[PDB]
Design a protein around this ligand. Structure first.
Ligand SMILES: [Ca+2]
Ligand SMILES: [Ca+2]
Lengths: 239, 126
RNA sequence: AUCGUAGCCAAUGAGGUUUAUCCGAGGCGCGAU
């Protein structure tokens, strides 16, 4: 009672979500503006961070491609030479000093945002593993914090049946899918195994939540056991 | 070797366990039984539980220790029996059951036996 | 798919198009049609 921790962690975890939204609005912006200079580059470097690092490295000067030690820290040597080739047969043209400032500032901000996301998640992983270690082991700290938020804490969560925990955070997208359905672990599966995976993961989350609500198995014994049980069922469903 | 978790309170003796399992079997026959901790939880939140029976050898025991708390909320009698195998056997089910709930049914031919068990339980909870 | 199901999984939840903060005992394999 009186300013409980979980709420602070739930809202910290929520920041990373806001940070991701800004991060790909910036990616979309950077890819749009850099397209004047090197329209092809976007389809050669799909990954957002690599792309941003690449436009930051190159700027106007596309012959910084050959033998560039800093570029070799971003791109595969094979994809370097494919962009170096694509660079000369080019289309795009030079940017003004003001067009460059625009991109450079956006790239620096994106890099800064990416590091903040990591430093906030570290906090969230650290504190979730004190608040609800067994739950966190199964669905990650982020999903655990999301469901704990909507439930209004661990005691409340722990007195819900598994079938309602499954539907926590449910919302024209996909019917009967909650935070659990959209967790990394469930989403890691083929589409056709997801509803069934959410059921299984929901059921074991409920069990873990209850153990956490009583502050037992604080080194995560129960969570790692349930995690192992889930993994072995996933293996058995697949080929 | 090894029995029994002190937190499984109150625990029925041999004579009460026999009564409980008998009545749980009848409840099943008369369509007044919910099997499973999850469904038990639902009966309590909805106020349709006559009483709750849980298994003392649920591991870990905390996967059902929310039930006594819920029951205290709802002024609903609960008891533990030693064996989840036996409870599932009494639930007409072919796997252990760690918790079940006999449900309120207006005009139940079982009112008298249910009322009796409630008293049996209540006098352990002091 | 249906019937038979002496092996496997399953109320610590089967399997969920309907009613999903809602439902609650089946599914798999096997044999036959
Ligand atoms: Ca990389
Ligand atoms: Ca009382």
């Amino acid at each position: 009672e009186a300013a409980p921790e979980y709420r602070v962690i739930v809202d910290a975890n929520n920041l990373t979500v806001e940070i991701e939204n800004e991060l790909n609005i910036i990616h979309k912006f950077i890819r749009d503006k850099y397209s004047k200079r090197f329209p092809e580059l976007e389809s050669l470097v799909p990954n957002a961070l690599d792309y941003i690092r690449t436009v930051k490295e190159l700027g106007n000067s596309l012959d910084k491609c050959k033998n560039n030690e800093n570029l070799q820290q971003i791109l595969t040597n094979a994809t370097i030479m494919v962009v170096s080739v694509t660079a000369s047969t080019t289309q795009g043209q030079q940017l003004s000093e003001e067009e460059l400032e625009r991109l450079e500032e956006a790239c620096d901000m994106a890099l800064e945002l990416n590091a903040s996301k990591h430093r906030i998640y570290e906090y969230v992983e650290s504190r979730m593993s004190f608040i609800a270690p067994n739950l966190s082991i199964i669905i990650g700290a982020s999903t655990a914090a999301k469901i704990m938020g909507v439930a209004g804490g661990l005691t409340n969560l722990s007195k819900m049946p598994a079938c309602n925990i499954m539907l926590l955070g449910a919302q024209s997208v996909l019917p009967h899918t909650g935070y659990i359905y959209h967790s990394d672990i469930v989403q890691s599966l083929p589409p056709d195994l997801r509803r069934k995976a959410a059921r299984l993961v929901a059921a074991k989350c409920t069990l873990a939540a209850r153990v956490d609500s009583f502050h037992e198995s604080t080194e995560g014994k129960v969570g790692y056991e349930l995690k192992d049980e889930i993994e072995r069922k996933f293996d058995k469903w697949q080929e | 070797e090894a029995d029994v978790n002190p937190k499984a309170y109150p625990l029925a003796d041999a004579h009460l366990t026999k009564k409980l399992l008998d009545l749980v079997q009848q409840s099943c026959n008369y369509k007044q039984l919910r099997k499973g901790a999850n469904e038990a939880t639902k009966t309590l939140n909805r106020g349709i539980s006559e009483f709750i029976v849980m298994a003392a050898d649920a591991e870990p025991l905390e996967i059902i220790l929310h039930l006594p708390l819920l029951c205290e909320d709802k002024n609903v009698p609960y008891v533990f029996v030693r064996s989840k195998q036996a409870l599932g056997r009494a639930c007409g089910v072919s796997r252990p059951v760690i918790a079940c709930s006999v449900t309120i049914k207006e005009g139940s031919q079982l009112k008298q036996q249910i009322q009796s068990i409630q008293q049996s339980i209540e006098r352990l909870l002091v």
